[PDB]
């Protein structure tokens, strides 16, 4: 008698869903998900270029392993009523019984399934909320086009107790610094993690804590992510990330503080007449900014906004989607705008006469401007 177990629907469907998120639409076995009963519980595993493993509680009548369709299983478990789920492997098929429902799923040979990679030594751990918020912050600025793979990752730099996360699409740079518990100290390394997979692992708020695995004194070629009984590993990118510490300005010629939500909605309103959503123009004066977009053939939009402004007036244009992306990623009520010139990038940070210094904040969104 092969694997037989019984467990609740919610845990089963959530685990199978979390593992199935990383399964792309190369081999039939690659499209399958692995169920393994053990005395500890039930394990759901999947592997492509990134692995996902979920350990949940279950009543194991008989132990064993089986291989079933990942997408199909996630659909079934998602669409099942909330009842104890009884899974029993019969020969080459799986009998899944939940309430009044009974499913017969065909199986694939378990021997033909690859062995999952072992997670490296634990480098450190940080709260799950901080991880999800930070990765969601920096991931928005990474490149989404695989044509430039150097931009498609998130740069993870670890110096001792301090961790820095950076990503850039060449048009915007998002950097987030945070503190974590590192074991052991004096670890200094930097790697490039693919942005999409890290963003999926973050979007991982348990609660409790998330553990990242590199290996302490040299870094492996893989990154582990662990917590809430869930383990995922991604292969690191071998490309080179540009130096982002030089691109950040030390001091600004003009600084402007505004309200994030008001500015975001204003950009949404003014950008409706923009040509192919090209750009939104900002005219900064004392106490007020003027948002403008579009041309005379489609339409012209104009809005004046209250600003706390310092320095000489300047006119600068941005991509409306990039600017709203930064403002949204700030996750604060007010925004601090650094400005040097209209061709130089602008510094966005969450919130007399001469130039003003850049305040030190954990998150920073650096956005390049557009021509006029």
């Amino acid at each position: 008698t092969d694997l037989t177990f019984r467990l609740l629907r919610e845990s089963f469907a959530d685990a199978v869903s979390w593992v199935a998120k990383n399964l792309p639409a190369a081999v039939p076995v690659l499209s399958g998900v692995l169920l393994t009963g053990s005395d500890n519980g039930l394990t759901i595993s999947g592997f492509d270029y990134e692995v996902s493993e979920a350990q949940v509680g279950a009543e194991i009548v008989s132990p064993g392993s089986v291989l079933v369709s990942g997408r199909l299983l996630s659909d079934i478990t998602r669409a099942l009523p909330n009842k104890p789920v009884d899974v029993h492997v019969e020969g080459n098929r799986v009998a899944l019984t939940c309430g009044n429902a009974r499913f017969s799923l065909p199986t694939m040979p378990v021997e033909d399934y690859p062995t999952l990679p072992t997670l490296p030594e634990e480098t450190g751990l940080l709260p799950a909320e901080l991880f999800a918020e930070a990765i969601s912050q920096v991931a928005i600025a990474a490149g989404r086009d695989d044509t430039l793979p150097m931009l498609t990752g998130i740069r993870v730099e670890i110096l001792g107790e301090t961790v820095v996360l950076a990503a850039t699409d060449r048009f915007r740079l998002a950097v987030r610094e945070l503190k974590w518990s590192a074991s052991s100290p004096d670890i200094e390394a930097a790697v490039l993690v693919p942005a999409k997979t890290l963003a999926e692992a973050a979007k991982g708020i348990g609660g409790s804590d998330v553990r990242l695995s590199l290996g302490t004194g040299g870094k492996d070629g893989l990154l582990g992510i662990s917590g809430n009984g869930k383990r995922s590993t991604t292969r690191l990118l071998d490309a080179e990330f540009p130096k982002f510490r030089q691109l950040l300005p030390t001091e600004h010629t003009a600084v402007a503080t505004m309200d994030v939500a008001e500015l975001i909605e204003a950009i949404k309103l003014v950008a409706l007449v923009a040509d192919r959503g090209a750009q939104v123009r900002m005219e900064f004066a004392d106490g007020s900014v003027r948002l403008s977009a579009g041309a005379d053939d489609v339409g012209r939009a104009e809005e004046d906004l209250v600003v706390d402004y310092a320095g000489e007036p300047l006119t600068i244009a941005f991509n409306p989607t990039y600017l709203t992306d930064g403002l949204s990623s700030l996750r604060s009520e007010r925004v601090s705008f650094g400005f040097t010139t209209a061709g130089k990038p602008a510094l966005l940070r969450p919130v007399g006469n001469g130039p003003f210094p850049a305040v030190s904040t954990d998150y920073v969104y650096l956005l390049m401007p557009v021509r006029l």
Partner: peptide, 5 residues
């Protein structure tokens, strides 16, 4: 749209 690098 200008480039950072």
């Amino acid at each position: 749209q200008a480039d950072l690098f």
